[PDB]
């Protein structure tokens, strides 16, 4: 029944609003100058960086500080994604080892999917939308770190052209988590049973919410390819960073996810 698929879509969106405090709708209102939401302080250079601590709530050399800010924010995102994952029907009923596997491989793909909501071609919201850091400033960071965000901006620019909203994205990230082709999965068939249902819900949602967007379903699914590539690029970059910066600490939670291979 298409009715059961609408109710699932409604459940996932409601749980997505409950788990993720900075939605695409809030991010867009900040980025475009709406009266619903307030204006970000903009970090584009070192003085603006230093000025931002006075005006922005934080708790933080500059490339190292910025990169560890991103990783602390990533750790928080893993907390939110993990709470969203529990709400996807059937997920908590799976083999515990496979719940862990799905999270291990799913979480960064979702992080970079949702990061696109906070991006435009010029930069990225930070500190829950209170701040905005320009793309050029990030590209100017010392040698290595200078390229760590550019693959995220490039994808975001193409991803944001799909014009998805949070109700669309709620189902999409659920589809991402419940991939039965993740390495090391014990019981693939129950996982695939859930994804099948999630894919039907996503498909119906895209037809009703975007009835003039031809093959949006297929074009969104093709984007899954870009996410995989961003993750494997990021992992390579992290292997370099940790060799050139022996004094820089990665969070153990992210360190346990990065099993790659």
Annotated binding site: 71-74, 108, 234, 258
* Residue among 70 and 94 whose Cβ is closer to ligand GDY: 70
**Cα–Cα nearest to 46, from 136, 154, 147:** 136
Q: What is the spatial distance between Cα 65 and Cα 50, in angstroms, rounded to a whole number?
A: 12
Cβ proximity of 253 and 80 under 8 Å: no
Question: Smallest distance, Å, CB 253 to ligand GDY?
Answer: 10
Site for ligand GDY in 93-152 (CB under 6 A): 108, 111, 115, 124, 126, 133
Select from 9, 27, 31, 66 the one that contacts ligand GDY (CB under 6 A).
66
Question: Smallest distance, Å, CB 106 to its own copies?
Answer: 13
* Residue among 111 and 175 whose Cβ is closer to ligand GDY: 111
Q: Which residues bind its own copies (CB under 8 A)?
A: 158, 179, 181, 196, 199-200, 203, 214-215, 217-219, 221-222, 224-229, 232
List the beta strands (DSSP E) in the chain: 41-43, 119-120, 123-126, 131-134
**Cα–Cα nearest to 205, from 40, 16, 35:** 16
**Residues with Cβ < 8 Å from 177, sequence gap 6 or more?**
81, 85, 88, 91, 102, 103, 106, 110
**The Cα angle at residue 254 between residues 253 and 258, in degrees rounded to 5:** 120
* Residue among 109 and 166 whose Cβ is closer to ligand GDY: 109
Q: What is the DSSP letter of 142?
A: S
Question: Smallest distance, Å, CB 147 to ligand GDY?
Answer: 12
Question: Smallest distance, Å, CB 184 to its own copies?
Answer: 13
User: Which partner, its own copies, ligand GDY, none, binds residue 224 by CB below 5 to 8 Å per kind?
Assistant: its own copies
Interhelix angle 2-19/166-177, rounded to 10 degrees, is 90
User: Which partner, its own copies, ligand GDY, none, binds residue 173 by CB below 5 to 8 Å per kind?
Assistant: none
Question: Smallest distance, Å, CB 228 to ligand GDY?
Answer: 15
* Residue among 203 and 226 whose Cβ is closer to ligand GDY: 226
**Residues with Cβ < 8 Å from 32, sequence gap 6 or more?**
none
Phi, psi dihedral angles at 39 (to 5 degrees): -80, 135
Q: Site size for ligand GDY, by CB under 6 A? A: 14
* Residue among 73 and 210 whose Cβ is closer to ligand GDY: 73
Side-chain-side CA neighbours of 11 within 13 Å: the count stands at 14
User: Which partner, its own copies, ligand GDY, none, binds residue 228 by CB below 5 to 8 Å per kind?
Assistant: its own copies
Site for ligand GDY in 201-260 (CB under 6 A): 238, 254
Side-chain-side CA neighbours of 243 within 13 Å: the count stands at 7
- Contacting residues toward ligand GDY, per CB under 6 A: 66, 69-71, 73-74, 108, 111, 115, 124, 126, 133, 238, 254
């Amino acid at each position: 029944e298409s009715a059961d698929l609408r109710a699932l879509a409604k459940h996932l969106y409601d749980s997505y609003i409950k788990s993720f405090p900075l939605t695409k709708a809030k991010a867009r209102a900040i980025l475009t100058g709406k009266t619903t939401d307030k204006s970000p302080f903009v970090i584009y250079d070192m003085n603006s960086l230093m000025m931002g601590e006075d005006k922005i709530k934080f708790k933080h050399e500059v490339a190292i500080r910025i990169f560890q800010g991103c990783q602390f924010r990533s750790v928080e995102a893993v907390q939110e994604i993990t709470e969203y994952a529990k709400s996807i029907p059937g997920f908590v009923n799976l083999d515990l080892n496979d719940q862990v596997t799905l999270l291990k491989y799913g979480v960064h793909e979702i992080i970079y999917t949702m990061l696109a909501s906070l991006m435009n071609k010029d930069g990225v919201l930070i500190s829950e939308g209170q701040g905005f850091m320009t793309r050029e400033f990030l590209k100017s960071l010392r040698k290595p770190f200078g390229d760590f965000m550019e693959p995220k901006f490039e994808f975001a620019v193409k991803f944001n052209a799909l014009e998805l909203d949070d109700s669309d994205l709620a189902i999409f990230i659920a589809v991402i988590i419940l991939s039965g082709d993740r390495p090391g999965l014990l019981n693939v068939k129950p996982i695939e049973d859930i994804q099948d249902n999630l894919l039907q819900a996503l498909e119906l949602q895209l037809k009703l919410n975007h009835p003039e967007s031809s093959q949006l379903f297929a074009k969104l699914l093709q984007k899954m390819t870009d996410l995989r590539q961003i993750v494997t690029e990021h992992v390579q970059l992290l292997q370099v960073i940790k060799k050139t910066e022996t004094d820089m600490s990665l969070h153990p939670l992210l360190q346990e996810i990065y099993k790659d291979l």
